[PDB]
Structure 1
Amino acid sequence: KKPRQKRTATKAYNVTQAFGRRGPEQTQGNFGDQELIRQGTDYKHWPQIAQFAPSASAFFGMSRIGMEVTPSGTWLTYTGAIKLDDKDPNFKDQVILLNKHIDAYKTFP
């Protein structure tokens, strides 16, 4: 039922079904290995990924936001960067986990 931005992926409604196939196009998402894509927020290390996701206030606070109002459709666009905390004892594990999921689709069979 829900607008795309408010969906929560799970094993019953997975990342592909919720957000489309992972791929190279500007309008496709590129994040997730095979296990994350199948499990969504059921994934065993989801809480470690979700720690980087913005609050509603931070999404509107930190990002560069645009509006593309066209004859074909309107899109709110967003871009930004979130600094990892070097001095967090889990930093090395975070780097590893993010490395596993970013562009992982490139290697799928």
Structure 2
Amino acid sequence: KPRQKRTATKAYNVTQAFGRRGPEQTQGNFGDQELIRQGTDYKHWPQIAQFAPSASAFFGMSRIGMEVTPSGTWLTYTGAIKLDDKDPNFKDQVILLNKHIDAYKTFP
């Protein structure tokens, strides 16, 4: 199955499925060590996954493009998802997302 259809778990983790966390255009930057090692087994995974798009929304909400580089042919995507600041758990949701965004920068 292609990379975009993989699901990370304890036995096949985020790094294995999706590469090291990092800053470059081809890399993902999301996840602290616990999420990287556990994937969808991570204790707070469903609280993160609520923000992941359906296939329909992915193609409906995003700015989609095609690029061709020496490495290959790429379907590019970009977008933004608004958090509901009336959700009771809003403050915690933001805290959780921020804990995982660029977590790798403090990997010792």
How many aligned residue pairs are there?
A: 108
CA–CA distance in 2 between the matches of 1:33 and 1:17? 15
Determine the C-alpha separation between the residues in 1 that align with 2:26 and 2:68: 16
SS of aligned partner of 1:79: strand
1:17-66, Cα deviation, whole Å (9 max, x unpaired): 00000011111100000000000000000000000000000000000000
Where has structure 1 moved over 4 Å in runs of 4 or more? none
TM-score, normalised with respect to structure 1: 0.96
- Relative to structure 1, the CA distance from residue 46 to residue 28 in structure 2 (aligned partners, 3 Å threshold; closer, same or farther) is same
Structure 1 CA distance for aligned equivalents of residues 87 and 46 of structure 2: 16
So what's the TM-score if we normalise by structure 2? 0.97
Q: Distance in 2 between matches of 1:84 and 1:24?
A: 24
Please say which of residues 64-73 and 41-50 is displaced more in the overlay: 64-73
Question: What is the Cα-based RMSD across aligned positions, in Å?
Answer: 0.9
**Whole-angstrom CA distance in 2 between matches of 1:70 and 1:21:** 22
Q: How much has 1:73 moved relative to structure 2?
A: 1.2
Q: Give 1:88 shift.
A: 0.5
1:48-94, CA deviations, whole angstroms, 9 ceiling, x for partnerless residues?
A: 00000000000000000001134541100000000000001010110
1:101–1:71 CA distance, 2 compared to 1 (3 A): closer
Cα distance, 1:99 vs structure 2? 1.1
**Which range is displaced more, 28-37 or 65-74?**
65-74
Per the alignment, do residues 48 and 69 of structure 1 end up closer, same or farther by CA in structure 2, a change over 3 Å counting?
same
